[PDB]
């Protein structure tokens, strides 16, 4: 019962779409559709990015597209700028009222 899988780091140029995904056990992500993503700049508290697999929270523009397929939860990044240098985190329901968080991604802007 360890953390959910996540790639170590991502990189890319501004202006295009960047894909990130979490895979896990079907008892965690494959059985329940309660998966959310988090963005954390280093220095203060993170901010909520997405409620469901896809329904937008208030104060966030349509730039962050989420989806779920099988056991893969994917977030795609459209239109990168300098305000994206942060960390991206999975979290999901796991049964027995437990929440499992993801591993962590480092994003560098080229």
């Amino acid at each position: 019962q360890s953390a959910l899988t996540q790639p170590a780091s991502v990189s890319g140029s501004p202006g295009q779409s960047i894909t990130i995904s979490c895979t896990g056990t079907s008892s965690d992500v494959g059985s329940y559709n309660l998966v959310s993503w988090y963005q954390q700049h280093p220095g203060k508290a993170p901010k909520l990015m997405i409620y469901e697999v896809s329904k937008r929270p208030s104060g966030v523009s349509n730039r962050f597209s989420g989806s779920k397929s099988g056991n893969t939860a994917s977030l795609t990044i459209s239109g990168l700028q300098a305000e994206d240098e942060a960390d991206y985190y999975c979290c999901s329901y796991a049964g027995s009222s437990t929440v499992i968080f993801g591993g962590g991604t480092k994003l560098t802007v080229l």
């Binding site: 959310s36 508290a45 993170p46 909520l48 329901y93 929440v99 962590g104």
Partner: protein, 126 residues
């Protein structure tokens, strides 16, 4: 506007206990859950159990049972977290986060929708 404030940064020694108090202001906090997360500097987040400010039910994650207690105080709108038996790798930052909505009809405890967060507190040991 609602706010979540915490205690100061704590320095400790292994084999002790630590109190962290999270205070919520600006809204009726008894209708919303309260989750706790921790993060060592350099690695990811992980999750402890929630507290329900209506009745007093409490869950916990694994490797925390018999080690951590959570307490309400509804008079001044705050939640206490006691963590005992500290060891060397517990140096981290702690955040208290608002959970779902208690609605008297569904188990909304495990809905990972943390929208408002505290500033976090830094607890270190030597």
């Amino acid at each position: 506007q609602v706010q979540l404030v915490q205690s100061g940064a704590e320095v400790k020694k292994p084999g002790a206990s630590v109190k962290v108090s999270c205070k919520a202001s600006g809204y009726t906090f008894t209708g919303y859950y309260m989750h706790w997360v921790r993060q060592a500097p350099g690695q990811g987040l992980e999750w402890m159990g929630w507290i329900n400010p209506n009745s007093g039910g409490t869950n916990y994650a694994q490797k925390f049972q018999g080690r951590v207690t959570m307490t309400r105080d509804t008079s001044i709108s705050t939640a206490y977290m006691e963590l005992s038996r500290l060891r060397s790798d517990d140096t981290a930052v702690y955040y208290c986060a608002r959970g779902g909505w208690i609605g008297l009809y569904y188990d909304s405890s495990g809905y990972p929708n943390f929208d408002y967060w505290g500033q976090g507190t830094l607890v270190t040991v030597s």
